[PDB]
Structures are given as C-alpha cells and as structure tokens.
Amino acid sequence: FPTLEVTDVYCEGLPKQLLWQLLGLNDLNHHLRTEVTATELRLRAAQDRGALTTEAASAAMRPFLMEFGTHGLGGRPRVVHVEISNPTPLPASWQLHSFDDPDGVELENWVEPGRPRTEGERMRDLIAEYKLFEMRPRSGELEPGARCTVTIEFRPSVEGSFELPVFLHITDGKRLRLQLQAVTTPEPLQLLALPPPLRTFRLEPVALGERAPPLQMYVLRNGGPAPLHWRLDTAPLAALAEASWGHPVLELVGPEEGDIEEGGVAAINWRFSPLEAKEYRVEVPVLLGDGGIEVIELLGRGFAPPPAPPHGAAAVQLDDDTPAAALDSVGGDAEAEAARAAAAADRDWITWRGLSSAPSAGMAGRLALVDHDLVSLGVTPVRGLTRRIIVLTNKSRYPLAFDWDLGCLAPPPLLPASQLQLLAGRPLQGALAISPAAGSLEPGERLVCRVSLHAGVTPQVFEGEVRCHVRIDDDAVAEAEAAAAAAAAAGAAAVAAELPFVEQVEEVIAEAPVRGPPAPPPAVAAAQRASRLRSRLPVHQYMTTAVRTRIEPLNAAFTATMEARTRRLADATRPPSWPEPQSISVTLRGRILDERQLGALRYVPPHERAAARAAVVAGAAWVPPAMVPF
Amino acid sequence: MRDSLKTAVVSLVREKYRKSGSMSPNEMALLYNDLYGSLLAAVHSSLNDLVDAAAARPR
Amino acid sequence: MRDSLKTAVVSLVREKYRKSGSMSPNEMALLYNDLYGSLLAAVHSSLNDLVDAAAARPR
C-alpha cells in the first residue's frame, strides 16, 4: 500500500523531540506504516457520492491531536514544517481534505455558509475567515523517497480556543484525521509544556539495591504565555516515603520552585530508588503563579537484579545489543523490559523509525544548518570527557554571528577534579562546553564545533537542549560597504587626477536674470523624455484639472492615485534584506553511568550496548586525571 | 603528524562509509559526527593501551 | 582516592598473593578476606604514629 512517513519537523525555537512528541508523530508514523485498513474502504466509499460528513468522519476515524498549545494574543505566528516521504516503492498521491475547506469547486454567486448557530462550527468558520490554520501544499504527490516539505501555520490573531479537523486522505491507502488544537489567550495565563508523554513520565527501571540511582532529568517549558512561576508539592512524595518504611523514593534534587522565562527551559532531577518490583505510581501537583494543577504522574518499576555474587565467585572480565535478549538481560523481570520499552518510546527519539535526525525541513529561509541535529552523546563513565562534533553551514549569502547558549546545561561559574562540589545544585551534573563560544562565519563556510561534556560523580541521564543564535553580521556588512566607499573615493581621486581642478560653482549671489539648469544634449533630452513617458500615469486614471474641478470624487481619486504612486517607491527603496536573527537548537542526550553499572550494563540502552561494552573492555572514554591534591 | 594520520583517515572513511576516500566536505557531510566518534574512540583505545603498558593494569 | 589506592592495592596483591592453586570459590573468598585484612593491618600500622600522637590516652 502506498503510504507516507514524516521524517522530521522544524519549528521556531522548539526542540525537535518536543515537536515530535507534541504532534504525537510516533503514533502517526506507526499507523501510516502498518494497518489492514478495514473501515477505510467504507470511508472512501462514503467520500465518493458525497456521503461523508466532517462530524461523522471525525467520530469514526479516531483523530490524532495536533497540539499547538496556547499563544499570546498578537504573538508571532507559529510555523510547522513537516517532511513527507514515500517509504513504499509505489509513488504516493495524497490530498489533504476537509469538507469545510474548499474541495476544488468554483463558487459563483453562492452565499457563504450561514450562521452556524453551533459554536463548534462557528469556531471552524472564524478559522476559515481569518486564515488561522493554513497548510500550504494542500494536495501533493511524491515519487518513492521524495520529500514534500509541507508547511502548516497558525495565526494567533483572534482570542479563544480553536479546533480544526483535517484529514490526510492518501489516494490509495489509509486516511487519518488530524485535529489542529490551539488556544489564543488575550491574557497571560501560565500553561506549562504538557505533552501526553511528559504528563506520565515513564521513569527508567532502576536496580533495587543501586548504590546511587541515576538522576533523571525532566524539562519544563513555559509555552506561549507570560513567564511561569512553578512550585512542586513534595507532600505526595513524603507520603510515599512514609508508606515505604521511611525510605526516600522518587526524590526531587533541584529546587522545589522556580521561575521559567517565556519559552524557557527548567530542569528537575529525580532519583528513583525502589524497594519492590511493583509499579511505583506517584502523582505530584504543580502550583503555578495563578491557580493551576498541571499534575504529573511518575511511573517506575523495580529492576530485580541477579543476586550479587560473593567476592569469591565473581565473573572475570577482560550479549548482543540488538535482540530482545539484551532487554531481558537488562532486567530479568517480564514487565521491566516493557517499562524500558515504554520509556524508550517516550524519550529516546533514536528508536523511532521515522525520525531522521537531520535538518530535513526548513531548507529555505534558515540562515544556517547544523549538519546533524538531535545529537546523542554516548554513554559515559563517572568522570568522563566525551566529545562530539557538530558542523554549521551558512546558507545565507550574508555573514553570520554564531553564539552558543545552554538552557539548563550551563556550567557553574574542564571542571577541577578535586572541586566537583560546584556541580551541586546543577541539573546536568556535568560541564558542557563548545570550542567556538561565539564566532563569525562567512557565507558558505562550514565550521566544526566540538561539544565536550565533563561529567561529575553522580550518575545521571540527561536529554537537554543547547541553543545556537545566528544573526546577520552588521559589523561585517558595514565593513564591506565602507570598503566600497573607499574604492569609490579612490576612483574619484583618479578622475580628479585625470581632469585637474574641475570647476564647481559654490553658490550664486543675485543672478539678475533667472537662469535655469543647462540644457541637456538633444539625445540626452530624448532619453529623459522616454524615461518620463515610461511609468506614465494610466489613461483611465488621469483626471485633468477641468474634470477634477467639475467632479470632486474624481479629484479625490486622482489624489489617492498620486499618493499610491508615491508610496510604491518607498517599498522598492527600502532594503528588504537583513532577516530576523534565528535561534536553532540541538538536543543532546547522554548517560552518565557508574563503573559498576557500566560493567554490568545495568542502564545502557540496547541501542548502545555494543558501544558500552567496547568502552568497558577497552578504554574508549577519556578520564582527565589532572593532579592529585595530596 | 597530521599528514601521517591523514592516509589512515582516508582509508577508514572509505572502508566504514563507502565514500571512496572523499576529502570533499559535501560528500562526507552527514558523517562528520560518526567519523569523529570512531576516530576518537580508536585514539582513546590506543592511549589507554599505552597507559596500561606503562603501568600494567590487571585487564 | 579510589584510583590511587586501587593502583597501590594491585601492586600489593602482585607483590604478596601469588600462590594461586586449585582456587575453589570458598578459598578465593578466604583469600579476598586475607588481602582485605592485610590492607587494614597495613593502614593501621601506618596510622599508629598519628593514633599515638593523638591526645587520647595511648593504650
């Protein structure tokens, strides 16, 4: 069956993992990949002969939520670039259809849809009226392996909520409904980033007797409205501890409260220390500045590790990563691997088949490209210095200033081995650095940037986001213009050398007869006449003085046309270049693991178990020793 | 030393990524991260082996 | 501390405990206890100077 796949999605100032999670593209890719499509045949039959209706189709088609969240009124519209490709060899023709929207039918003196009298259809009609939700390509067709680069944009100009259902409608294949859900708040009301995978955070299963449970990072984003003041009530966790014979479980490490700026990132570290193999469902509230719940459920399980051998009989040291045997070896429990797979689908973007971890969409209009987005730092030892390289390319013909920022990944004001206590209270428990902090870059120049992580003593799993800000280099462009001006001055000096002391009349004092400008040569006069006759005012719009005096509205129209023609010059004269500074972002995920955990492969994902075993058996990660204090 | 390593680098590029020893940035793009990771892993393995030889590790 | 003491302990083990033999798990556990006790005795012997120098009555 000719199907489609979403390879990647690009949006301004939002992590690619977060965008994929918010759109729920895992389920979309799965459904578009495999389905018998029993009822879709009936759906196509009803689409034929015009039997289908939007409401019934939505009720029977199991819509998928395209969540755009909340947008402050008057804020910048949000754009979503989705790359659609054909995994199947058969060429795929697809037609985004929605019966409310026009279906390629010519309207001639047909009254627009009347007063709906039902607020759902009314909201649909306001969306249609004010172009709130628009997908540019509409219907398309793709050869096997092609990329369509579809764009869907939302315009936060109206107040209130808006839900618009459209459906993909592949010509021969499945037809899935997407419900674009957004709310535009005229007033600032904090709403934390609340994707369904983040609401129920699937904690990675951990060893029952682990000496130091791995810190697990949870990232909160403000969203559209004003900055969010969050406070997490530890009382349910305290109740859990009291129930668990007074042992700390699901402990919060960071601050209990905080103030995320608009479109910001705040990281909270959890320690999951279990006592049983049972599920540990714990529900915690999030009190915002204004009244709110935003409750978060944490789920984890017990690893039930193989019994630790006595020192006498220990496995000597000097199994395949891919198979499910690896998952079973990482946790003998039947449901431990199920929880691990759920957590992988929740957070590990690599395991998702569709995602490409490439710049993909957004080729046009982006100042620069990171060659490889969504970069994963490998599993690292306790005090490990792990490096990766990311190359940035300037597509713009203009020089670009490149600055590097860390949202929650900032180093404390690499790290000295003795004085690692500075890492206390820091979400990463490591020091991220990039070799170019801020560098200029010429057009078409590719720069290598080394991202290096120096980890601390606390085992951790980080999935952070690092921002790179690209702006047009005003200094460089001004220098170029100044060089051009200097060249022009040199040319003027050369012309002066050619013609010594050309006279220029400084001023005029009482020239008794009025003297006009010198007459041009007749050829130049003819050329100027032809130039004037070009851009001649249109015949039907030129009102003579007599007609203007006779008819006032014609005089007003003539004045308006003069004003319009004067205005037309200003837009041309304005230099349309210098686009807005653009912030790109790359997600980095890594596993700071203890030596015992690495040796036993306790928490390495199956995707990287081969690399973990390599790093254990043969030293593959550096451990900067520095100098001992004593 | 960099010129000494460059030949082995070209050989590894050709072997691992089937790029026919492309020193051209455009072709070997989208492989810089993996190539650098493999090269640094090899360098670290060699350095650790030398360190163990200097101070015999029970490995 | 762990790294430096690990190097020292490996050196010590190679220095003293190299009898080996049948090496049943129980005897290996006993050997581990023996080396741990030797380490503790060495630490105590090294620190006895400061222990005596401490203001507490030297018994």
Bridge partners (DSSP) listed for residue A154? A78, A133
Q: Which of A357, A375, A391, A588 should one mutate to test binding to chain B, selecting the residue with the greatest count of B CBs within 10 A? A: A391
Closest CA to A249 of A282, A217, A218: A282
Q: Which residues from chain A sit within 8 angstroms of residue B33, using beta carbons?
A: 371-372, 375, 388-390
Alpha-carbon radius of gyration of chain C: 15
Give the tokens for residue A433.
């650095």
Residue pair A17/A463 in contact by the 8 Å Cβ criterion = yes
Place of tokens 């710049």: A359
- Tell me the nearest-neighbour CA distance from A250 into chain C, angstroms: 29
- Tell me the nearest-neighbour CA distance from A209 into chain C, angstroms: 21
Chains that touch A (3 or more CB pairs under 8 A): B, C
Cβ contact A618–B25 (<8 Å): no
Q: Which of A211, A311, A382 should one mutate to test binding to chain C, selecting the residue with the greatest count of C CBs within 10 A? A: A311
Q: Which residues from chain C sit within 8 angstroms of residue B48, using beta carbons?
A: none
Cβ contact B41–A614 (<8 Å): yes
Query: Number of CB pairs < 8 Å for A and C?
Result: 18
Q: Which helix (H) or strand (E) holds A46?
A: helix A38-47
Helices (H) and strands (E) in chain B, counts: 3, 0
- The angle formed by the CA atoms of residues A76, A81 and A87, to the nearest 5 degrees, is 170
Identity of the residue numbered C6? K
Q: Which residues from chain C sit within 8 angstroms of residue B58, using beta carbons?
A: 10
Q: What is the end-to-end Cα distance of chain A in Å, rounded?
A: 70
Q: Give the Cα separation of A350 and A354 in Å (integer).
A: 9
Residue in chain B lying closest to C7 (CA) = B57
DSSP letters, A551-612, are -HHHHHHHHHHHHHHHHHHHHHHS----PPPEEEEEEEEEEE--HHHHHHTSS--GGGHHHH
Q: Give the Cα separation of A201 and A347 in Å (integer).
A: 9
DSSP 8-state symbol, A540? G
Identity of the residue numbered A340? R
Where do the H-state alpha helices sit in A468-544?
Answer: 474-498, 522-533
Residue among A310, A625, A628 whose CB faces C29 most closely: A310
- Tell me the nearest-neighbour CA distance from C31 into chain A, angstroms: 8
Cβ contact B29–A448 (<8 Å): no
Coil, strand or helix at A439: strand
Cβ contact C25–A628 (<8 Å): no
Residue pair A97/A54 in contact by the 8 Å Cβ criterion = no
Q: Which residues from chain C sit within 8 angstroms of residue B57, using beta carbons?
A: 10
Give the tokens for residue A403.
């600055």
CB atoms within 10 A of CB A6: 23
Q: Which residues of A181-213 are buried (b: 16+ CB within 10 A; e: fewer)?
A: bbbbbeebbbbbbbbebbeebbbbbbbeebebb
Which stretches of chain C sit within 8 Å of chain B by CB?
7, 10
Residue among A312, A625, A628 whose CB faces C29 most closely: A312
Q: Give the Cα separation of A391 and A448 in Å (integer).
A: 4
Q: Which residues from chain B sit within 8 angstroms of residue A318, using beta carbons?
A: 59
From the centroid of its chain, how far is CA A197? Answer: 17
Chains that touch C (3 or more CB pairs under 8 A): A, B
Closest CA to A315 of A598, A609, A595, A600: A600
Q: Give the Cα separation of A452 and A402 in Å (integer).
A: 18
Residue among A389, A391, A620 whose CB faces B45 most closely: A620
Q: Which residues of A26-52 are buried (b: 16+ CB within 10 A; e: fewer)?
A: bebbeebbeeebeebeebbeebeeeeb
Closest CA to A177 of A56, A58, A29: A58
- Tell me the nearest-neighbour CA distance from B45 into chain A, angstroms: 5
Residue pair A193/A221 in contact by the 8 Å Cβ criterion = yes
Q: Which residues from chain A sit within 8 angstroms of residue B40, using beta carbons?
A: 387
Q: Give the Cα separation of A624 and A615 in Å (integer).
A: 15
Q: How would you classify the pairing of strands A368-370 and A400-406?
A: unpaired
Dihedrals phi, psi of B8, to nearest 5 degrees:
-60, -35
- Tell me the nearest-neighbour CA distance from A310 into chain C, angstroms: 7
Residue pair A241/A248 in contact by the 8 Å Cβ criterion = yes
Q: Which residues from chain A sit within 8 angstroms of residue C31, using beta carbons?
A: 312
Give the tokens for residue A38.
């029993």
Q: Can you list the pairs that A116-122 forms with residues at least 24 positions away whose Cβ atoms lie under 8 Å?
A: A120/A163
Roughly what angle, to the nearest 10 degrees, separates helices A25-33 and A16-23?
Answer: 60
Q: Give the Cα separation of C13 and C33 in Å (integer).
A: 12
Cβ contact C28–A628 (<8 Å): no
- Tell me the nearest-neighbour CA distance from B37 into chain A, angstroms: 7
Dihedrals phi, psi of A461, to nearest 5 degrees:
-130, 115
Q: Which residues of C8-32 are buried (b: 16+ CB within 10 A; e: fewer)?
A: eeeeeeeeeeeeeeeeeeeebeebe
- The angle formed by the CA atoms of residues A87, A90 and A93, to the nearest 5 degrees, is 90
Q: How would you classify the pairing of strands A64-72 and A92-94?
A: unpaired
**Interruptions in chain B after residues (C–N over 2.5 Å):** none
Alpha-carbon radius of gyration of chain B: 14
**Interruptions in chain A after residues (C–N over 2.5 Å):** 318, 413
Residue among A317, A371, A614 whose CB faces B32 most closely: A371
Residue in chain A lying closest to B51 (CA) = A619
Output the CA torsion sign for A56, A57, A60, A65: negative
Chains that touch B (3 or more CB pairs under 8 A): A, C
- Indicate which technique resolved this structure: cryo-EM
Coil, strand or helix at B8: helix
Q: Which residues from chain B sit within 8 angstroms of residue C8, using beta carbons?
A: none
Identity of the residue numbered A281? R
Residue pair A272/A300 in contact by the 8 Å Cβ criterion = yes
Closest CA to A150 of A353, A358, A8: A8
